[PDB]
Amino acid sequence: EEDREAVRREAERQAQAQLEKAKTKPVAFAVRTNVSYSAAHEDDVPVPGMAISFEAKDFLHVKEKFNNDWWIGRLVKEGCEIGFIPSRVKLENMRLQHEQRAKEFKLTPPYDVVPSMRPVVLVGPSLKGYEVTDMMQKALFDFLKHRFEGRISITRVTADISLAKRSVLNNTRSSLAEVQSEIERIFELARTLQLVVLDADTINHPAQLSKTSLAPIVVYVKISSPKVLQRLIKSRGKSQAKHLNVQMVAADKLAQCPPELFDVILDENQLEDACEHLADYLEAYWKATHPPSS
Ligand SMILES: [Hg+2]
């Protein structure tokens, strides 16, 4: 078992070399996992112990391809460095192997391409297009413009991106051609790993983007008390007091929406504190996608 380890030791040395250079290379593409994976019990791994494990719904940045079974990349989490990631074919084969084993007792798809930076989307306090909500979101946008100036892009999205259901695109106001055009734009904005914030007028609920391929960071601008909301709108004149109704319910709908559908929830009494809470979240997200050795 001496001459055998000869070839293996070298391949492992080469694999390591490629893994190292990849640390600074850019992100070819990002994926959201639909299944979990553990390298805990396997061989066939280029550099023993360098395979990355993940749970379903995790985000991965794929930098380059090693071979038909492994890609090189990292998990998007602070401190996580480059590592080997199983390829789609590899995961599918593992699915087959496990099924065979299951039958021997005689008792889809794993990755979704996603933008390299999760686009930030704001919903709440109520309906967009009006004022209470528009002004409060407009505030957060200006804050983010400065807090992350030089590393962020805030772009308006008129096209109804809520029509961008994976299945639909894989096959109404805006047209699919226009939507697809915007998704591409979103994807291309996050390419260089800069922070991407969207001002999507058609999105008031997280469910409108659940089936899409944007995997956004849904930010819930929540005003805890309904009374606070009511008063707030009233102080906008009859040009808003009339449209009052369509604002309380919309707000109440978000209020009943399960927190899981939200990534961040801004329910601070002071607007200055909402900003800082978001900045902190984005600052950590920024670190999860950037940091040391790149
Ligand atoms: Hg890792």
UniProtKB/Swiss-Prot annotation:
Lineage of producing organism: Eukaryota, Metazoa, Chordata, Craniata, Vertebrata
Residues of the whole record sequence present: 61 to 441 of 632
Organism: Oryctolagus cuniculus (Rabbit)
First and last residue of the signal peptide: none
Name of the protein this chain belongs to: Voltage-dependent L-type calcium channel subunit beta-2
Family to which this protein belongs: Belongs to the calcium channel beta subunit family.
Domain SH3: 26-95
Subunit structure: Component of a calcium channel complex consisting of a pore-forming alpha subunit (CACNA1S) and the ancillary subunits CACNB1 or CACNB2, CACNG1 and CACNA2D1. The channel complex contains alpha, beta, gamma and delta subunits in a 1:1:1:1 ratio, i.e. it contains either CACNB1 or CACNB2. Interacts with CACNA1C. Interacts with RRAD; interaction may be involved in beta-adrenergic regulation of heart rate and contractile force. Interaction with RRAD regulates the trafficking of CACNA1C to the cell membrane. Interacts with TMIGD2. Interacts with CAMK2D. Interacts with CBARP. Interacts with CAMK2A.
Source taxon at top rank: Eukaryota
Primary role: Beta subunit of voltage-dependent calcium channels which contributes to the function of the calcium channel by increasing peak calcium current. Plays a role in shifting voltage dependencies of activation and inactivation of the channel. May modulate G protein inhibition. May contribute to beta-adrenergic augmentation of Ca(2+) influx in cardiomyocytes, thereby regulating increases in heart rate and contractile force. Involved in membrane targeting of the alpha-1 subunit CACNA1C.
Compartment(s) of residence: Cell membrane, Sarcolemma
